């Protein structure tokens, strides 16, 4: 979604430093408001201490800052943050791999639903659309980016993802629960009807198509599960309390105290707490990692591109089962027909990558 | 890719020490430039303090160094680095196991696509090439090492991985998305056509070949996913900010202060911060682990050898379905035909490894 994969392909001098200059989906963009509020509260307190407090009040503030500073300890924050963010990242990738792709069903429907006639074409196209509909229905239930594009079931119809008859049949089935599973049932019935009409040879080929359907259903279920079962609220609150406890301590504890009073640890007054602000970006930015990935189907820069996926799948799906049904290129003899040990060429820049075969660690390299 | 597996086979005296003398894919090669910049910035600051600053300025620098040194804390860096590098290492191995291997399809196509005639040969060879093409297409999309070898679809054709007719059919199919999935559809269609021509006996055998194809498609999808879905940028920036914050503190904090002033902790002046430089190799090298494996398909020393894999797969693939179709050695009686409990020999060096059968922990060893 914010892909920088090609920038970090090699481990060169500025592989990671270069990324500090990027704004899209960056730490600056996510921390902006929070950082400013921190900056303000800090320098506000700083001026109150330098310009308002009396000599006697300043002595109390200095004693209060020493108290607060002794409680700004990251080690407990690092512990709970690391674990929580690890949990979020785990679910984040699991949710991605749970986005259903048509390609596996697409391959079977394209080759095993017979007929080069309009009905065979309508049959194959309708089967794929039942798959894409099972997906679009669940995606608009879990993704705010998709829902805002299909806010009502009418949008789904007008977008060409569901026919008005299907919508009628959809409404006809009375159920109080999410009907995303309906197209998945239609598919199995239509696949069986297709087999009875002789469009699907065996039951082995039919069950094979039914299996890939069931797999797609399990994908939609996983998406439903992660949307329904949030990370327990108590856990989320714990990590924000811990993080905020730290920044609360820093607000006062990290104040630059009087250099003249010579407090151990506060010998220099820089006015601006460089390292405390660097700690804020670290921990507030670290919390923002979880903050952004806790729901990867939202509208964040790094949230999944669910609407593009829908478009790509629609185009590719139909194309593979229609224009490509039993449509192959001209079979030719391959360029290595009479060559048992082909030696495919290398460009000038890639010849260093033509390596001898790795036989095993145990063998002597001679 | 940089395999030292045989060197670390045994846990001897210098099993790991020996590896500190290796340059290829080493910590020295990856840290070289960064270390020099650190070295320079350090000793530059060191000379400014020893030779330029006035007695009064030196006192401020010493107070500034005590401030910076109090913020060079590795514990928070260790937390975020360990977690981040673990995530990178996790994806690193997942991407490797996502590199498709022909061997499973290779075994089925070689034995279940009938015919010892030129067509049967062309059929089997074309089926394998559709698999290898599905792979090469995705590999050149995710690997810079491969792309620089196949920068254009013409390179793929001229290299013998795609026929010009296939390229024509390829172009004929209008789609704005990556067509790496095309050969995977052709395969299923060609496998079905082969079955209708009587070259594949049952549908059980056909579905079995279609399944191994779908698995290969899922492999290509995983590669696409890891290339598309980068580790969230904010997370990457967080760990570089944390690491750099530490080295910023060390640049000044780890300066050798005046021994005469007798600062607690700074009683000895060695001019060269041995342990601080050793800490740099540790953390900068630890960050380089993630820096190198975050994209294992690049051109790093330890990045995957994707071009060799392509070559090996091409050679082995065709060879197994052509020269090896229904081609077996002469069936003989095995050397242990009349021996129910064979006792295979051992070399002189390996006799210590002939052990009695492990029956279970519960049994008395007598």
């Amino acid at each position: 979604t914010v892909t920088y994969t090609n920038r970090v392909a090699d481990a060169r001098l500025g592989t990671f430093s270069q990324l500090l200059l990027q704004w899209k989906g960056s730490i600056y963009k996510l921390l902006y408001s929070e950082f400013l509020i921190f900056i303000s509260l800090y320098f506000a307190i700083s001026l109150v201490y330098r310009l308002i407090l009396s000599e006697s009040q300043r002595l109390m503030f200095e004693k209060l800052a020493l108290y607060c500073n002794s409680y700004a300890e990251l080690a407990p924050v690092s512990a709970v943050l690391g674990a929580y963010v690890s949990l979020v990242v785990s679910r984040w990738w699991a949710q991605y791999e749970s986005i259903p792709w048509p390609d596996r069903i697409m391959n079977l429907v394209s080759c095993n639903v017979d007929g080069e006639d309009e009905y065979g074409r309508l049959l194959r196209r309708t089967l794929m659309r039942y798959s894409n509909l099972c997906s679009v229905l669940i995606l608009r239930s879990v993704s705010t980016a998709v829902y805002k594009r299909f806010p009502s079931m009418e949008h789904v119809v007008r977008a060409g993802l569901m026919t008005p008859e299907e919508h009628k049949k959809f409404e006809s089935l009375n159920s109080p629960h999410n009907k995303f599973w309906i197209p998945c049932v239609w598919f199995s019935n239509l696949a069986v009807k297709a087999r009875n009409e002789g469009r699907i040879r065996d039951s082995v080929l039919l069950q094979g198509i039914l299996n890939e359907l069931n797999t797609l259903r399990s994908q939609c279920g996983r998406l439903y599960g992660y949307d329904w079962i949030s990370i327990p609220l108590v856990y989320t609150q714990v990590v924000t309390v811990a993080v905020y406890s730290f920044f609360l301590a820093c607000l006062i504890g990290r104040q630059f105290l009087d250099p003249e009073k010579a407090y151990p640890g506060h010998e220099l007054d820089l006015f601006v707490p460089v390292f405390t602000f660097l700690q804020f970006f670290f921990y507030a930015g670290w919390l923002k990692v979880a903050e952004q990935l806790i729901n990867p189907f939202g509208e964040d820069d790094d949230d999944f591109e669910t609407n593009w996926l829908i478009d790509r799948n629609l185009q590719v799906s139909l194309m593979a089962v229609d224009e490509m049904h039993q449509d192959l290129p001209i079979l030719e003899k391959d360029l290595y027909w009479n060559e048992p040990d082909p030696q495919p060429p290398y460009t000038a820049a890639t010849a260093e990558y033509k390596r001898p075969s790795f036989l095993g660690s145990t063998f002597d390299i001679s | 890719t940089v395999t030292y597996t045989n060197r670390v086979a045994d846990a001897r005296l210098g099993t790991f020490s020996q590896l500190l003398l290796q340059w290829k894919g080493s910590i020295y090669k990856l840290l070289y430039s960064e270390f020099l910049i650190f070295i320079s910035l350090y000793f530059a600051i060191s000379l400014v303090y020893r030779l330029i600053l006035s007695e009064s300025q030196r006192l401020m620098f010493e107070k500034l160094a005590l401030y910076c040194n109090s913020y060079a804390e590795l514990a928070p860096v260790s937390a975020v680095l360990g977690a981040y590098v673990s995530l990178v290492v996790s994806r690193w191995w997942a991407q490797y196991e996502s590199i498709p291997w022909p061997d499973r399809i290779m075994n089925l196509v070689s034995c279940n696509v009938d015919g010892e005639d030129e067509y049967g040969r062309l059929l089997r060879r074309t089926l394998m090439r559709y698999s290898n093409l599905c792979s090469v297409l995705i590999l050149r999309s995710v690997s810079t090492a491969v792309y620089k070898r196949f920068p254009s679809m013409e390179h793929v054709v001229r290299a013998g991985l795609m026929t010009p007719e296939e390229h024509k059919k390829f172009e004929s199919l209008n789609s704005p998305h990556n067509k790496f999935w095309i050969p995977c559809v052709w395969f299923s269609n060609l496998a079905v056509k082969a079955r209708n021509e009587g070259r594949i006996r049952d549908s059980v055998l056909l579905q079995g070949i279609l399944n191994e194809l779908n698995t290969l498609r899922s492999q290509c999808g995983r590669l696409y996913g890891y290339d598309w879905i980068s580790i969230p940028l904010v997370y990457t920036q967080v760990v570089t900010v944390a690491v750099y914050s530490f080295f910023l503190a060390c640049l000044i904090g780890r300066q050798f202060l005046d021994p005469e002033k007798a600062y607690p902790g700074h009683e000895l002046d060695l001019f060269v911060p041995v342990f601080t430089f050793l800490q740099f190799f540790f953390y900068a090298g630890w960050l380089k682990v993630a820096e190198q494996l975050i994209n294992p398909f690049g051109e790093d020393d330890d990045d995957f050898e994707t071009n060799w894999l392509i070559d090996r797969n091409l050679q082995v693939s065709l060879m197994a379905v052509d020269e090896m179709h229904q081609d077996l050695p002469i069936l003989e009686k095995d050397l242990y035909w009349n021996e129910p409990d064979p006792q295979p020999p051992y070399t002189a060096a390996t006799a210590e490894y002939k052990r009695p059968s492990f029956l279970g922990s519960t049994f008395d060893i007598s």
Partner: antibody
Amino acid sequence: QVQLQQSGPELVRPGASVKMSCKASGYTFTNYWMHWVKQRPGQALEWIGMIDPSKSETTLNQKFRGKATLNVDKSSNTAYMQLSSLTSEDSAVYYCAREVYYFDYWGQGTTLTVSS
Amino acid sequence: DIQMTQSPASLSASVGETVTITCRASENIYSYLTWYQQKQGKSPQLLVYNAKTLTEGVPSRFSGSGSGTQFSLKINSLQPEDFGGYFCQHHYGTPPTFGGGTKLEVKR
């Protein structure tokens, strides 16, 4: 049709610098590496270097390390080569070729003459 | 670097004849060799690539062979056009050094 149209012939005084062009057309500029070859009468063709149009990664010949410079303009689909500290020996015919495991398309050539 | 040694420096033959140019590699370059034809004043043209494969326009009378360190171009049944310059180039790595060349002149 693939066509590599280089700049016209050039004449410069020793010590100066020159920058010749090569405009490609009829194929995707960024998908093929661009090479530069030097042709002197009586000597064999010398490989100067190559350039990756996409990322402008250059790979020169050690023999031309300080003499040649490569860069491209993806927008205008043209490649450039700059020769510095020109001497009488830098006088020759300079080609730009497209690579596809081979040099299948060359330019007409740019004749460089260095004299006072 | 890989050294390309071409021979003969110049061959003289008349129409109808069959000549054979030879390029020898300093080290193993597998099948990574190309043959170019260059007529005085014009820019070179690709004849054979990948050691054996003929390019588009090249007539059947041209054929290449060899592998490893020994390659050869063979022009059977010469023509008037076939008279001019001929050189080879290896394509295994960087820099892709060229051959010395061969001047194919008419014999009278």
